[PDB]
Design a protein around this motif. Sequence first.
Motif, PDB file in Angstrom:
ATOM      1  N   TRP A  26      -1.389  -4.254   4.086  1.00  0.00           N
ATOM      2  CA  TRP A  26      -0.619  -3.999   2.868  1.00  0.00           C
ATOM      3  C   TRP A  26      -0.967  -4.951   1.734  1.00  0.00           C
ATOM      4  O   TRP A  26      -1.839  -5.814   1.872  1.00  0.00           O
ATOM      5  N   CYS A  30       1.440  -2.343  -3.483  1.00  0.00           N
ATOM      6  CA  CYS A  30       1.412  -1.055  -2.793  1.00  0.00           C
ATOM      7  C   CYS A  30       2.798  -0.499  -2.422  1.00  0.00           C
ATOM      8  O   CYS A  30       3.367  -0.870  -1.401  1.00  0.00           O
ATOM      9  N   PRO A  32       4.010   2.639  -1.287  1.00  0.00           N
ATOM     10  CA  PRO A  32       4.096   3.284   0.034  1.00  0.00           C
ATOM     11  C   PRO A  32       4.123   2.253   1.166  1.00  0.00           C
ATOM     12  O   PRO A  32       4.693   2.504   2.227  1.00  0.00           O
ATOM     13  N   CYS A  33       3.501   1.095   0.939  1.00  0.00           N
ATOM     14  CA  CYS A  33       3.475   0.025   1.943  1.00  0.00           C
ATOM     15  C   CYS A  33       4.876  -0.566   2.080  1.00  0.00           C
ATOM     16  O   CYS A  33       5.378  -0.747   3.183  1.00  0.00           O
ATOM     17  N   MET A  35       7.482   0.761   1.531  1.00  0.00           N
ATOM     18  CA  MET A  35       8.367   1.807   2.010  1.00  0.00           C
ATOM     19  C   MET A  35       8.475   1.818   3.536  1.00  0.00           C
ATOM     20  O   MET A  35       9.543   2.105   4.076  1.00  0.00           O
ATOM     21  N   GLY A  90      -1.526   6.124   5.389  1.00  0.00           N
ATOM     22  CA  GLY A  90      -0.447   6.666   4.582  1.00  0.00           C
ATOM     23  C   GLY A  90       0.923   6.274   5.098  1.00  0.00           C
ATOM     24  O   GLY A  90       1.052   5.713   6.183  1.00  0.00           O
ATOM     25  N   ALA A  91       1.944   6.561   4.302  1.00  0.00           N
ATOM     26  CA  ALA A  91       3.322   6.271   4.669  1.00  0.00           C
ATOM     27  C   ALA A  91       3.783   7.317   5.694  1.00  0.00           C
ATOM     28  O   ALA A  91       3.211   8.407   5.777  1.00  0.00           O
ATOM     29  N   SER A  93       7.528   8.535   8.304  1.00  0.00           N
ATOM     30  CA  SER A  93       8.924   8.280   8.662  1.00  0.00           C
ATOM     31  C   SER A  93       9.016   7.536   9.992  1.00  0.00           C
ATOM     32  O   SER A  93       8.003   7.263  10.649  1.00  0.00           O
TER      33      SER A  93
END
Length: 106
Positions: A26, A30, A32-33, A35, A90-91, A93
């Motif tokens: 990360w 960033c 998305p990071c 997140m 990528g991000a 869940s």
Amino acid sequence: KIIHVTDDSFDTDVLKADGAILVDFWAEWCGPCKMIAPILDEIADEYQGKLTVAKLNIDQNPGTAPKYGIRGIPTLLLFKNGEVAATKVGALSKGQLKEFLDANLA
């Protein structure tokens, strides 16, 4: 609990480590990071004993990422026996991370 890796401690903390290590690449900028950072903190708890979570800030440690063909962040590498066992870019869940982990930890 979450290993703070650097360009200097990568080889010893990851390559010579005995077990499954999940490395999070990360950077402060960033989104998305930032997140998925909370999710990693919780994953470290639910997978205590069968997984070690580490994180490498690319801005402060700009050397390791290139050697592993990392083209962007966030990107997660699952090292096993000193070598990449699985990759995820990528991000994602909580669920997607667990399924990914359960499937490649067996």
